[PDB]
């Protein structure tokens, strides 16, 4: 049960152990490229709860995104820009999810989970081969990742009236004139 | 009359059957469907494997019919099967 200990350790990001490790790894990532491949996840508890397996077809990619603003505010998060740049780099893979790893005063760092849809191990295995279907091409481009669902306001309740079932879809339904045959 | 005011005793006729239901001038199609539902069914009984029969045979050969002793045995009962479970397998096999 090592992953429950790892989950509680990531809760205390300001502690001596975690802040020391996040310091020496922030320097290490800046010595490398903006987008590069990680052999293993740096946060194995977080990747595993997001759907990572040590199988042939799962890869992990590290990415920096420049933090700040454009006084205009971008409507998607910096995690979304991190996912789209990795997906452009690996066009044959599918973006499953992504997670925060490090944060600087100039860059935000993320690690992206990718799945190969043409690997036989992925295709023969149910509970992952939904990503092989062509409806899941470039989920990060269309806002189907975890950060995409938060930005589009897809939550139940009276506090998300304009954003459930699509904002532009709900606006269009409210602005067509419906004329029947017997008026 | 109900001493306890419960509505369920009016409708009455913790384990139930799971895979089927116990049930108790008209069109011909409905009559044909009634005969097909109540037609007797072949049982397709389930037997035991060959190695299971020798394991039960060696158990009776050393202990007779004392199921409490075969449960406590270890060489002839490597999985600690309970005397109630072994007695059920014996009755299916044919030897008591």
């Amino acid at each position: 049960g090592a992953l429950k200990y790892l989950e509680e350790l990531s809760k205390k990001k300001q502690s001596d152990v975690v802040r020391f490790l996040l310091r020496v790894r922030c320097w290490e990532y800046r010595q490398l490229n903006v987008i590069h491949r990680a052999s293993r996840p740096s946060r194995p508890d977080k990747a595993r709860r997001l759907g990572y397996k040590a199988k042939q077809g799962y890869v992990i990619y590290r990415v920096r995104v420049r933090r700040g603003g454009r006084q205009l505010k971008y409507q998607r998060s910096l995690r979304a820009t991190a996912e789209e740049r990795v997906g452009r780099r690996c066009s044959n893979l599918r973006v499953l999810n992504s997670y925060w790893v490090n944060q600087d005063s100039t860059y935000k760092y993320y690690e992206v989970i990718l799945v190969d849809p043409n690997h036989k191990a992925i295709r023969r295995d149910p509970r992952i081969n939904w990503i092989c279907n062509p409806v899941h091409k470039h989920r990060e481009c269309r806002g189907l990742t975890s950060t995409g669902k938060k930005s589009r306001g897809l939550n139940k309740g009276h506090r998300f009236n304009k954003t459930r079932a699509g904002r532009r879809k709900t606006w269009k339904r409210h602005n067509t004139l419906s004329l029947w045959r017997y008026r | 009359s109900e001493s306890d005011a419960v509505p369920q005793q009016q409708q009455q006729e913790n384990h139930i059957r799971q895979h089927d239901l116990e049930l108790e001038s008209k069109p011909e199609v409905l009559r044909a469907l009634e005969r097909e539902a109540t037609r007797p069914v072949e049982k397709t009984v389930r037997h035991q494997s060959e190695r299971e029969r020798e394991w039960l045979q060696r158990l009776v050969d050393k202990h007779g019919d004392d199921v409490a002793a075969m449960a406590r045995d270890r060489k002839l009962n490597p999985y600690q099967q309970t005397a109630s479970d072994i007695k059920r397998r014996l009755k299916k096999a044919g030897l008591l």
Binding site: P126, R127 | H19, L30, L33
Partner: peptide, 21 residues
């Protein structure tokens, strides 16, 4: 299919039934 799905369809499949009028 997953083998947990196959076990559920083996023991509880969709049945054939009718309702009288």
């Amino acid at each position: 299919v997953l083998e947990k799905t196959k076990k559920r369809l083996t023991h509880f499949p969709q049945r054939k039934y009718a309702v009288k009028a």
